[PDB]
Design an enzyme around this catalytic site. Structure first.
Site, PDB file in Angstrom:
ATOM      1  N   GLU A  35       0.694  -1.022  -0.158  1.00 13.31           N
ATOM      2  CA  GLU A  35       0.027   0.067   0.100  1.00 13.31           C
ATOM      3  C   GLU A  35       0.835   1.373  -0.220  1.00 13.31           C
ATOM      4  OE1 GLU A  35      -3.599  -0.498  -0.506  1.00 13.31           O
ATOM      5  OE2 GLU A  35      -2.084  -2.156  -1.138  1.00 13.31           O
ATOM      6  N   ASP A  49     -10.058  10.369 -13.704  1.00 17.30           N
ATOM      7  CA  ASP A  49     -10.900   9.312 -13.168  1.00 17.30           C
ATOM      8  C   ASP A  49     -11.508   9.661 -11.725  1.00 17.30           C
ATOM      9  OD1 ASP A  49     -11.135   7.425 -14.498  1.00 17.30           O
ATOM     10  OD2 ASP A  49     -11.012   5.894 -13.251  1.00 17.30           O
ATOM     11  N   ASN A  60      -8.646   4.332  -2.261  1.00 19.05           N
ATOM     12  CA  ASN A  60      -9.037   5.103  -3.129  1.00 19.05           C
ATOM     13  C   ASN A  60     -10.463   5.486  -2.582  1.00 19.05           C
ATOM     14  OD1 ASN A  60      -8.741   5.262  -5.403  1.00 19.05           O
ATOM     15  ND2 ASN A  60      -9.570   3.151  -6.436  1.00 19.05           N
TER      16      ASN A  60
END
Length: 130
Positions: A35, A49, A60
């Site tokens: 991560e 996005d 996210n």
């Protein structure tokens, strides 16, 4: 505001997550590693996005956590992404669980699927004295 394999492991075990039903401490470490362990600076936004990868656990913001600047995200955690940029990972753990709690599962971090499920990542945790 920094966390390393050991530390993370210790904390995890100190919190009571290391060795979860499925998620293994080693998997956590390896994961937290894939991560963006170290300093809680794991921050990578991307409007292209309408998604942002923030949090030591590279979470996210296109689904988890939120902010309020993007009336679209689907904060499944329902918390301030910043909460994942604090000192205590309590939020990272709470959210982590609140996230994995979904039908997604650690799988979400396919990375671990190509980092943990490859070799013995136990040698990474094995040394702290666990």
């Amino acid at each position: 505001k920094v966390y390393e394999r050991c530390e993370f492991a210790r904390t995890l075990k100190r919190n009571g997550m290391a060795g979860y039903y499925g998620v293994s401490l080693a998997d956590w470490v390896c994961l937290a590693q894939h991560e963006s362990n170290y300093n809680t600076r794991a921050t990578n936004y991307n409007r292209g996005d309408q998604s942002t990868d923030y949090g030591i656990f590279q979470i996210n913001s296109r689904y988890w956590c939120n902010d309020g600047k993007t009336p679209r995200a689907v904060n499944a955690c329902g918390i301030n992404c910043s909460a994942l940029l604090q000192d205590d990972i309590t939020a990272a753990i709470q959210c982590a669980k609140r996230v994995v709690r979904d039908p997604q599962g650690i799988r979400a971090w396919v990375a671990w699927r190509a980092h943990c499920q490859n070799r013995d990542l136990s040698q990474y945790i094995r040394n702290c004295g666990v």
